[PDB]
Amino acid sequence: ATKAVCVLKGDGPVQGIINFEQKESNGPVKVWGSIKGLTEGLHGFHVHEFGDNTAGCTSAGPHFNPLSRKHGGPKDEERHVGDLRNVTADKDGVADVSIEDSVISLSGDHCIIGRTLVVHEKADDLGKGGNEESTKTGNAGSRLACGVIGIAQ
Amino acid sequence: ATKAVCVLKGDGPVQGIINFEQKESNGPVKVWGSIKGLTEGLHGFHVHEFGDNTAGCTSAGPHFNPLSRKHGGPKDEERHVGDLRNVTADKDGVADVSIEDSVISLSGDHCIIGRTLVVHEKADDLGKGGNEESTKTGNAGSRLACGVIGIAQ
Ligand SMILES: [Cu+2]
Ligand SMILES: [Zn+2]
Ligand SMILES: [Zn+2]
Ligand SMILES: [Zn+2]
């Protein structure tokens, strides 16, 4: 089993800690933790290509997309590797994150270690927003907080 | 060619940006950038095992040492993978860094992507200090700033 971690920070009050664990090579990855300081409701959640925080979250590049596919969310084969849909902040602006994803990995050519996890201002429309950008990015607005994904003990 | 980058931050004023470039698999890695806020003089400069910033630089773990060697200088055969050259700050607190290292790598068994770069309170003694601890850590004092090493464009 392999593990990773990410501390999310930005220019505002959004802060979080997200853990990753992958029991088997090419197996599902458990993603869990908490993000606070968010507005209630849906916030886009993505792995961006570059683990480059030199210009804050702006230098993280586009969605991690090694298979050169369209943006999506629900369907494993019809998304970018980095598309992790939305986190949901409850009434108190805390998102309790707990999901399992079978497309990201902590090794091999879908590996996310050394890349940037980003939480967004707005909901990701999952590719169904009805415009061209929806199929590129999901229209999730600004990057509120991010961090580089590191190897964990 | 591949590339990496690291933004070093801590609780004090020490901060910086360090770039990595490796033109060939298992070839030398150029390491260059700048760190500010430092006391004039030598400062230890290490790759630590874990890219875990959840307890600040403390959660980075030990020197990256996949070959289970003693601590040394970068030019020694007996060294940890993570034992890089000390950086040197001028009077104004700025260490402009430019080195090459042939033991770290951006892929393979010595890969440092997803690990942590740390700049220290004082000089690394290169394992030539006059105590036992010298050949464990190099006696470089506290961890002033650190960051996770990410994939760059
Ligand atoms: Cu160190
Ligand atoms: Zn995004
Ligand atoms: Zn996407
Ligand atoms: Zn060492």
Q: Specify whether the CB–CB gap between B45 and B63 falls below 8 A.
A: no
CA quadruple A109, A114, A115, A117: dihedral sign: positive
**Measured between CB atoms, which of A7, A52, A53 is closest to B54?**
A7
Name the pairing type of β-strands A41-48 and A29-36: unpaired
Residues 6+ apart with CB under 8 A from A64: A46, A47, A48, A49, A80, A81, A82, A112, A115
User: Which residues of B are marked as active site?
Assistant: 46, 48, 63, 71, 80, 83, 120, 143
Beta bridge partners of A7: A17
The DSSP line for A82-109 is TEEEEEEE-TTS-EEEEEEESS-BSSGG
Give the Cα-Cα-Cα angle A149, B103, B115 (nearest 5 degrees): 15
Residues of A in Cβ contact (< 8 Å) with B82: none
Q: Residue A76 carries which DSSP code?
A: T
CA quadruple B104, A55, B148, B128: dihedral sign: positive
DSSP3 helix / strand / coil % (chain B, rounded to 5) = 5, 40, 55
- Exposure class string for B34-60: b at 16+ Cβ within 10 A, else e: bbbbbeeebbbbbbbbbbbbeeebebb
User: Does B110 show up as a binding residue in the annotation?
Assistant: no
Beta bridge partners of B100: B30
Is A150 in contact with B53 (Cβ distance < 8 A)? Answer: yes
> Could you report how far apart the first and last alpha carbons of chain B are, in Å?
10
Residues of A in Cβ contact (< 8 Å) with B114: 4, 51, 113-114, 148-151
Give me the domain span that covers residue B99.
1-153
Q: Exposed (0-12), middle (13-18) or buried (19+): which is B76, by Cβ within 10 Å?
A: middle
**Nearest 5°: phi and psi at A123?**
-70, 140
Q: Exposed (0-12), middle (13-18) or buried (19+): which is B129, by Cβ within 10 Å?
A: middle
**Nearest 5°: phi and psi at B17?**
-130, 125
> Resolution, rounded to a tenth of an Å?
1.3
In angstroms, what is the span from residue A47 Cα to ligand 2's centroid? 7
**Measured between CB atoms, which of B17, B114, B153 is closest to A151?**
B114
Q: Which two tokens stand for residue B10?
A: 């801590």
Q: Which two tokens stand for residue A82?
A: 């980095």
Indicate which of B8, B148, B153 best probes the interface with A, i.e. most A CBs within 10 Å of its own CB. B148
Q: Residue A122 carries which DSSP code?
A: S
Structural domain count, chain B = 1
Total CB pairs under 8 A between chain A and B: 84
Q: Which two tokens stand for residue B140?
A: 């470089």
Is B51 in contact with A115 (Cβ distance < 8 A)? Answer: no
Q: Which residue has the tokens 């805390």?
A: A94
Beta bridge partners of A88: A42
Cα separation values, A30 from A3, A22, A27, A63, A141, Å: 9, 6, 10, 20, 26
Q: Residue A137 carries which DSSP code?
A: T
In angstroms, what is the span from residue B126 Cα to ligand 1's centroid? 12
SS3 B116: strand
The DSSP line for B16-53 is EEEEEEESSTTS-EEEEEEEESPPSEEE-EEEES----
Q: Which residue has the tokens 């505002």?
A: A12
Query: In this structure, what CATH number is given to the domain that contains residue A16?
Result: 2.60.40.200
Q: Specify whether the CB–CB gap between B62 and B47 falls below 8 A.
A: no
